[PDB]
Amino acid sequence: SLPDLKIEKLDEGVYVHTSFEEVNGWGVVPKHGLVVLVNAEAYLIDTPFTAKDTEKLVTWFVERGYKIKGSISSHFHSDSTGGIEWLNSRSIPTYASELTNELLKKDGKVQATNSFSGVNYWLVKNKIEVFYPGPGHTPDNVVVWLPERKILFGGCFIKPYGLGNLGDANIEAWPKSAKLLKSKYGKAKLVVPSHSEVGDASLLKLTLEQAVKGLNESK
Template sequence: LIVRDGGRVLVVDTAWTDDQTAQILNWIKQEINLPVALAVVTHAHQDKMGGMDALHAAGIATYANALSNQLAPQEGLVAAQHSLTFAANGWVEPATAPNFGPLKVFYPGPGHTSDNITVGIDGTDIAFGGCLIKDSKAKSLGNLGDADTEHYA
């Protein structure tokens, strides 16, 4: 997800690889021509954190659920530079999400993974949940390898 926020860009999730993520960053530079201020990732799977080194090489601040950062090395992934923490009601603690602008980050509890978070864009009807949120026409929940199937539906 690419979000234009005034004179900057915010990114949610990487591509599967550093090369693919670098291609996305190049596209942003060519088409939007604004700096990427930060990136937040929705959970510790390859399709969401596989391009962390590309973000870091570009000088982009990266954020993830503290649990995602804990799980990332176990999954062979690079952790984000900053850890998000969440209040009892699920909303991100503002002090851990500085300069997030219109991004509203929420931890709904375990679902697709134990660490999955969602990102909304304030003032819109957009809710982005990585692999957690499915289209109403989806025939399955997808990859359940790390899912908490008791709470995910």
């Protein structure tokens, strides 16, 4: 059996949700995302793999008096977007980048209700910022920055030990994207990857090194 959904406090106003899935060819994969609290409102940063876990996650917060204001998905793969269909059915606003919605469409998946283009997008003014560093893990990957906490949710772009599945990756672009990310959020207090433990700004350097190595190995 898979472990259950976990929800744990990370910082004042920020929780990490971890879900688990058996992935063909990769084994059991943990997935971290965040929940961010602003007053009595909650924002989901990435959805769990399944509608079932998305509902569990939402219910956990609703029980504690929060209203679910929005969800943002970091990239098109299912481990960031699997709960979109369910959230949309409940009229909970969902957000994704234009590129993400286009990839969802092409992949036969329900799109986020709201989208944005460009490099910086403020989901919540002064509190939650979405940044696009360029193609890497996927063409559309974005990160989420909480300036009040200096916490960067790097999602599936942050790959400190190895790049993982390159099926949708842009190996030529990843190093330039990773350098841009590291120069932008080099002062991060915490960096939260999708598939490995929370770390400090060093995870940005390691991702860059891995991207550079991967490109070299590809040539």
